[PDB]
Structure formats: structure tokens, C-alpha cells
Amino acid sequence: APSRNGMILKPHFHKDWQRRVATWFNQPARKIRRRKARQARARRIAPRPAAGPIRPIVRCPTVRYHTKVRAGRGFSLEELRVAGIHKKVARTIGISVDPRRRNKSTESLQANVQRLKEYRSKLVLFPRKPSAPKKGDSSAEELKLATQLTGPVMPIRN
Amino acid sequence: KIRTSPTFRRPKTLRLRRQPKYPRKSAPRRNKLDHYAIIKFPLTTESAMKKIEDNNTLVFIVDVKANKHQIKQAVKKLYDIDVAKVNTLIRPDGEKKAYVRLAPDYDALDVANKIGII
Amino acid sequence: SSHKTFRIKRFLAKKQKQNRPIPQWIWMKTGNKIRYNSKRRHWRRTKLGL
Amino acid sequence: AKIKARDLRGKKKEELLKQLDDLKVELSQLRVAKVTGGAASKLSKIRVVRKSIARVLTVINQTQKENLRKFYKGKKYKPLDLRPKKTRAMRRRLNKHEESLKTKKQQRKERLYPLRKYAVKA
Amino acid sequence: GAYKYIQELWRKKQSDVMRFLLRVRCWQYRQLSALHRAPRPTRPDKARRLGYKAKQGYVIYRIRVRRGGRKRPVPKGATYGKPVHHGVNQLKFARSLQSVAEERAGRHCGALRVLNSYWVGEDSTYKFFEVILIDPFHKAIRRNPDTQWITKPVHKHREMRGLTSAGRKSRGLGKGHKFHHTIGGSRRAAWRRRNTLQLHRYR
Amino acid sequence: TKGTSSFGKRRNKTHTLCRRCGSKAYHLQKSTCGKCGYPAKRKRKYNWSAKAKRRNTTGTGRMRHLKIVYRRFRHGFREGTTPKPK
RNA sequence: CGCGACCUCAGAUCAGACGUGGCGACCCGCUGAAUUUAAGCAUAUUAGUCAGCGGAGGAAAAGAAACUAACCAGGAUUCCCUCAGUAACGGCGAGUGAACAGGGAAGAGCCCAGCGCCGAAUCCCCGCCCCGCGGCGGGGCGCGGGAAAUGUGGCGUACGGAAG
């Protein structure tokens, strides 16, 4: 019953809610669980970027957010084609692809072309056999300065 | 071939026998109810020593899964004797008792001494 | 009754051999806590099931 | 007589069975000695004979199955006793071979597009 | 190829050609038992699509399902509740009769694993469905790496859990605005998140 | 005469010892166990009796096979190998 | 009349495998109440909840758009924060009640049928030799058998593909 000037408030506790209470004593153990896995993965993907493959410059949809820029799902097939990267070879050298992404602008297209141009120059490519540097590889003195990129690779700034 | 019967009946089709590539179990499970495990022990009871010295029998405790045939061929092989008949009851205790009436060409008291009861 | 089955007579045979007191050398043990046999089953008082 | 398992495994098929049918006779004399009332010196021995029956029958049953899974070793169909018991689900798994079968289309993707060891600069 | 000609002929079910075959076979299917093995696919064409490669270990059972909805099993039509739950006659079962077919083929053939199924006839009283069954233990399937997904213990009784293509359509899943109530795993998984207090440690 | 006298006529049993679950709940006329349902392939258990489940589940008996599966798991279900001798 | 093919349904203690039952916290598929709330009560609410039934797994289900959107556009699924007690539902009463965008955890993609091309180029199984494995696999060697043109295998799948 209402006493005086109160707020006409409606709690959602008319169901058997006590059975389905999700407690967060997992949280500090979970943050260690995720962190131990993140370290063990980073040491596995041994000289590669820790955060994973490069994500493209992507505008946020809806009029609220289109003043901002994100990391996308992966690079469009015409962003790779104008850059001159094969969509099956892109994934192997650490480039995110999604075939779903159209390109409506030349601005976002040529920005993500110039993104892949900056990436491939930054890229250090090991031979598939150590005792056989093949034609599409890098030099020994440029292979010894290879360190895991802590943080997201080429961080996308607004 | 002419249809005498207005019934159709399934014809006697050929069936072959089990010609298996391997025996299911590797070896036969040995007879764990031996001649030894089928006779547990004799009764040295006053009632049973009467039965030995009066009726010319031996009173044994037998494994509950033994026939009167299985006892006779056990007592014949364990004690170098022969049995006239066997009479079996299962006790209130749950164990089986065998009143092993010997053939009268053997003194049960002289073979009760042989098995080693006094 | 007099007319029994081998399964029932086996059931009764077990419940006889469980219905005996403790051995008096069991209470002289180290980690001994047993005074008497608590599961002793008299035939007037408790009627064994069935 | 102290009977070990070391000194039985070198002995013969016909040798062990007679030693078993000697212990069975020795135990047949001790079971009587419990009922005829006396000899605590004998009553404590009946365990020593019971366990030495278990020693000889083990050495009998071990050399049975050593010979059987030696006999069926190279054979493709062997008895269900000799086949490897793990968990039931672990027998129902794919083979060491069948898990390692790639399709021709998948072998091509491994071949033409192999996963590169790469590193990027800051 | 012939399959495209059989495909588009099977879309002309109102034609004199197919109305003869869908009727004369539907007669033949009534005279057979409610669940029996078909020696082949009735439709070689449709079975190609749903994954039937004609090699050893692939099985096709022609099972019939008694046609109509579902009347509530209550004694003498008396549900002893509130006037909402008084309904019995005009009620409908949540899963399709094609899914009811697959889960009798799969229940009967517990050793096998149900791939898919396709319609082959309907009467006043029955529908008829060929159900594609696979052997997870025949070495033709157990060695083929693109069909050894059924051979793993995760795909035991797909038909019973609504993993078969016919079974999935009763759940209400898919992407977008129409399939919000099964976002997450299923209708059951959606319900849980929405009715769980995330009582954080700090809050 | 519905009480003390009517008790006297009780001399013919409905239930006997069931041969799956051992309980004295095997009805003789219906020929079905009121505890486990013996002629039924499946064990009779109901979720409305949490107490009746914990009486008769995997914690009750020996687990004479399932105790060694727990012992044989924690080395990886190894077979055929014996340790190095003396 | 007989004989050989095929099709179709049969029988076998036929050769070899496979399913059943249990556990059931979590997961999937169904089925599914009434207490209660509305100060009565019937729609609603309780609640797609308990009970019932089936099927699993170490996780399950979901999953690479017949999507969101209406932007300068995003790009599988799952989970967390927020959106939001909001849009909406409701004897518009009691109550019920998402989604997208955004910030993160994680991040991975793929295969067929069809259409077509190559002499079925494909597969299972039995005999012997030979390595060899307590996940029964490897190499031979057989006018040895079978499946399969009512379609196996390779290329190839909407991101296009193939041939020259």
C-alpha cells in the first residue's frame, strides 16, 4: 500500500527469481582464468601480434555514432584487391577478411587500402623452413627484431 | 508345382551354423565348484557321530549348488570309497548338509578315523 | 510357513546369523566404540518385514 | 612351505596343477581340524594355505592369458577378453588413422595457403 | 542432368503425370506397415540435396505419421483448471509431422543416426516421409572425413533434440527481428538470461 | 468391526521382494515393483521425491566397477603395460 | 514346363559390428499445471514455471545472414556491461517487457546437392605374404567378391565458378 508522495514503482520479483540468482564470486577467478589463457595463447602465437589480426577502419552506423570510427570484422574483398592481396593468403599473414562488407565510399575504401599498405611494410615474414629463406620472406637482421605487439595492432584513433 | 493347400506357408529356407572368426571369451572358465570346494567339512556333532557309528554314513557340509550326483562323485574321488545313496537338506543356517550313506563294504567309523575326526 | 521358497529361506538364513551378540574381544580394541549389538532382532517385537 | 610367485612362473603347466591339488588337500585337512575342536597352531595356518591357493591359481591364470594374447597378437579378430578395455565411449571413438584423414580439398588449403610465422613492427 | 528435370517435374504435383504417381504410390504405402525399410530413395533427386550419397551404410526408412493435429489427453475432455486450459480438440502439437516421422525412424533404428527426411505422399488419414538414416560404424562413413561428423558421440539422436532440418523449424530460430525470443542457444536459453538477476559482487 | 477385528484377517501378502531393487514392493497380482518397476526396462525414479532419489543412486551401493574407473582415469586408462621389475 | 536376369519383400545360433540401461548440476527437444497476484474473479499474472516424457555432452545448443539498418552505414554465433524497467504488451487494471547501435570477452571459418567435366578416375570386404599398433592401421598380391550410371570420386558453392 502507498503511504504518501512515493514513486509508483514495479519490482520484477513476481516469478521464482531466487532459483535464478547469478552471483559474481567467479569474477576475480574468471579475470585470472581469461588472463592465464590470454598469456598461454600469446606465448603460443609466438612472434605474432598478441591481440590478433588487423581490423579495418569502420564507420559506426546510425546518425548517433557516424561521427566515430571502430575496428571492423575484417577487410572487404575490393580493399584487398586494390591493395593487391589474395583473400585466401590475407588470413595466413594476419589480415582479417569478411566477404559481407560492401564499399559504398572511395573515402573508407582508399583509407582501408592505405591501411593494408602500412600493414605489409610493418609486417616481418619468417621462412616456413629456418634453413631455407624462400623468395617471399625477409632478411635475418630484420627477423631478430621481431617482438609480440602488446595491444591492438595499428590502433584505430578518432 | 500345384497348390493343394489354399494356405501360403513360409518355405524351409537353408540356415548355416556359427563359423566364428574368433571365440567370444578367450578360454573356458574353469570348474570353480571342484571335488574339494564341493565338500566344505564333516559334522563332528554328537547326533552325526551317532549317524556314523549306528547307520554307517558320513555327515558332510556341502556347497549349496551341488547335486546328490556331484557329492557321490566327490566323496568317491576325495576318500577312495563308494556311496550307497546321498540325502541332502539345506539347514536353517543356509548351508547344505549331506547324509552320505556309504556302501556296506566299508566301515564308516574306520574311514571317519581316516578323514581325521575324533 | 512350513512351505518355503529357496529365496525366502535364504533371506531368513541371513537374518538368523546377523541376530547374534558382539564378540567380547571386539571391545578390547584401540578405536573401540561398540557396547552391545544395536541391530539385534527379536521375533515377538520386530517382524523382519515380508 | 612359503610359496612365492617368482619361483612358480618358471614351473610347468603340469607342475603347478599338482601343487594346487596338494594345497587343496592340505586345506581339506585344516577345515576338518577347525570342526574336530582344537589346534590353534593349525587354525592360523588355514589363511596361509587359502592365500597360497590364490598365488598358484594367479600364476596358472596369468600364463594362460600371456599365451592367449601372444597367440592372437598378429591376428585381426581376437576374443573380447583380450581386446583393450578402456571406457565404452573411448572404444566407440574414431581410430588414430581416421581422425588424421583430411579430404583432398582440405589438403590443398594446407598446401597452397600454409599458416605463416609473422611479426609486425610498432 | 536428369535431376533438374526430376526437380521441376516434382514441382508440378497438380499435373496428370504426378497426380497418378502421388496417388498410386500413396495406395502402395498404406498397404505397407507404419514403419518399414525402403530399398532405395523414392526420390533419388531430393535425397541428393539432403545428403544421401548412394554408398553402403546409407539407409532410407519409409515411415507414415497419422494425419491431423493433437487433442489433449485428458479423461472425458475435463482439464480441471481455468477456462484458458479447458481447450482439448482444436490444439496443435509444437513440432511438424515430418519431425514426428524422423523421431520414430531414429528411435526404432537407435544404432543408426538420422540425417534428414522428405515428403513422398499425403492422404486424408496419413502423411508419408522417407527418412535418410546413416551408419556411424560402417567404414564407408567412418573413414570419409566430410561425413564422419555423424560418427562422433555429439550427434546421437539429432531427431530427438530438433537438430535434423525438419526438427529445427519447430524451435523458432534464425537471425533478425522475427527470431528475438530464441536469441542465445534457444527459446529456453533466451528465457534464462532475461529471468536471471546478475547480482554483481560490488553493485 | 472396521479396526481391531478386521486386522486379524490380514494373512495373504500383496508385495514380495523385488529382484532388481531388493525392496518389498513387488506386487504379485499387477506383477510390477511399486519402487523400481521391474518388468519396465527403465528404473522408476520421479523428480518430486529428491529424498527417494538419494536413497537409491550412485552414492548408495559399492560402485564395484565405477570405483576403479575413477582410479583408472587419473593415469589415463592405461592397458597392457606393467612397471619395470626389480 | 524349364533356365539365367533383375525388382521386391522374406528366413537364418549366417561373417562382422552396432543400439538398449544408468547418472542427470549444467544443456537440447517436447508436454505442461494450480497454489498465488489482481485485496472478489473468469482474460491476464503465477508461467512456458513445477511435475511428466525423451535425447545428450564435457560442455550443450547457437553459428558464418533469405541479418541489422535507413548511417558518411555495420557484418556468423555465444557471453558480459549498457540500451532499459525503455519501445511495446495489458479487465491499458494487477503486472509484463525485448531489440538495434555502442564498449568489451573470444574471434575462424567452411562443405555439399544442383549445374558441368574427365573411360567410376570412387568405395566396403575376403585370401596369402610383409611391417606393425592394447585407437585394426601401412605396403603389396590376386579374370577374388560386392556397392555404385536410380550416380561414387576429383575440380567447384553465391566471397562467384569452370574451361581455353
3-state secondary structure D17-70: HHHHHHHHHHHHHHHHHHHCCCCHHHHCHHHHHHHHHHHHHHHHHHHHHHHHHH
Say how far apart CA D88 and CA A9 lie, in whole Å. Answer: 58
Beta bridge partners of B83: B102
User: Which residues from the 46-85 window of protein chain A have CB within 7 angstroms of nucleic acid chain G?
Assistant: 52-53, 55-56, 58-68, 70-74, 77
Q: Which nucleotide is nearest to E109 (CA to C1')?
A: G19
Say how far apart CA A85 and CA A75 lie, in whole Å. Answer: 11
Beta carbons within 10 angstroms of residue A71's beta carbon: 17
Say how far apart CA F66 and CA B11 lie, in whole Å. Answer: 50
Say how far apart CA B25 and CA D13 lie, in whole Å. Answer: 21
Which residues 42-71 in chain D show a CB within 8 A of chain B?
64-65, 68-69
Q: Is the dihedral of CA D55, D59, D62, D64 positive or negative?
A: negative
Q: Give the amino acid at D102.
A: K
Say how far apart CA A56 and CA A112 lie, in whole Å. Answer: 6
Q: What is the 3-state secondary structure (H, E, C) of F4-50?
A: CCHHHHCCCCCEECCCCCCCCCEECCCCCECCCCCCCCCCCCCCCCH
Say how far apart CA B47 and CA B58 lie, in whole Å. Answer: 11
Backbone angles phi, psi at B115, to 5 degrees: -65, -25
Which CA distances in Å does E139 have to A38, D93, E7, E48, E57? 40, 13, 31, 21, 8
Per the entry, the structure determination technique was cryo-EM
∠ CA F33-F35-F39, rounded to 5°: 30
Beta bridge partners of B58: B100
Say how far apart CA B19 and CA A130 lie, in whole Å. Answer: 59
User: Which residues from the 60-99 window of protein chain E have CB within 7 angstroms of nucleic acid chain G?
Assistant: 70, 72, 79, 81-85, 91, 93-95
As to burial, measured by CB atoms within 10 angstroms (0-12 exposed, 13-18 middle, 19+ buried), residue D95 is: exposed
DSSP, res A103: -
Q: Where are the beta strands (DSSP E) in A74-119?
A: none
Which grid cell is D42? 593349525
- Nearest Cα residue to A55 out of A79, A31, A26, A34: A79
Say how far apart CA D109 and CA D98 lie, in whole Å. Answer: 19
Burial track B21-48 (b if 16+ CB lie within 10 A, e otherwise): eeeeebeeeeeeebbbebbebbbbeeeb
DSSP3 helix / strand / coil % (chain A, rounded to 5) = 35, 10, 55
Beta carbons within 10 angstroms of residue B84's beta carbon: 14
What residues of chain D lie within 8 A of the CB of E152, using their CB?
94
Say how far apart CA E111 and CA E150 lie, in whole Å. Answer: 12
Question: Shortest Cα distance from C11 to chain F (angstroms)?
Answer: 10
Which grid cell is A41? 595463447
Residues 6+ apart with CB under 8 A from D72: B22, B26, D78, D79, D82
Beta bridge partners of B100: B58, B86
Which grid cell is E1? 542432368
Beta bridge partners of E130: E62, E118
Q: Give the amino acid at D63.
A: T
As to burial, measured by CB atoms within 10 angstroms (0-12 exposed, 13-18 middle, 19+ buried), residue F26 is: buried
Cell 565338500 belongs to residue: B39
Residues 6+ apart with CB under 8 A from F78: F72
Say how far apart CA A31 and CA A35 lie, in whole Å. Answer: 6
Residue of A nearest to E196 (CA): A20
Say how far apart CA B44 and CA D35 lie, in whole Å. Answer: 7
Kind of pairing, strands E35-38 and F26-27? Answer: unpaired
Cell 489354399 belongs to residue: B6
Residue of F nearest to C49 (CA): F24
- Nearest Cα residue to B81 out of B114, B55, B49, B51: B114
Contact D52, D19 (CB under 8 A): no
Say how far apart CA C17 and CA B42 lie, in whole Å. Answer: 20
Kind of pairing, strands E197-199 and A21-23? Answer: parallel
Annotated resolution, angstroms: 3.1
Q: Is the dihedral of CA B8, B11, B12, B16 positive or negative?
A: negative
Residues 6+ apart with CB under 8 A from A41: A50
Phi-psi region of E76 (alpha: psi -120 to 50; beta: other; left: phi over 0): left
3-state secondary structure (DSSP) of residue E17: helix
Say how far apart CA B95 and CA C16 lie, in whole Å. Answer: 12
Say how far apart CA E137 and CA E148 lie, in whole Å. Answer: 10
Residue of C nearest to B92 (CA): C13
- Nearest Cα residue to D101 out of E135, E142, E54: E142
- Nearest Cα residue to A58 out of A46, A44, A76: A76
Q: Which residue is nearest to nucleotide G35 (CA to C1')?
A: E81
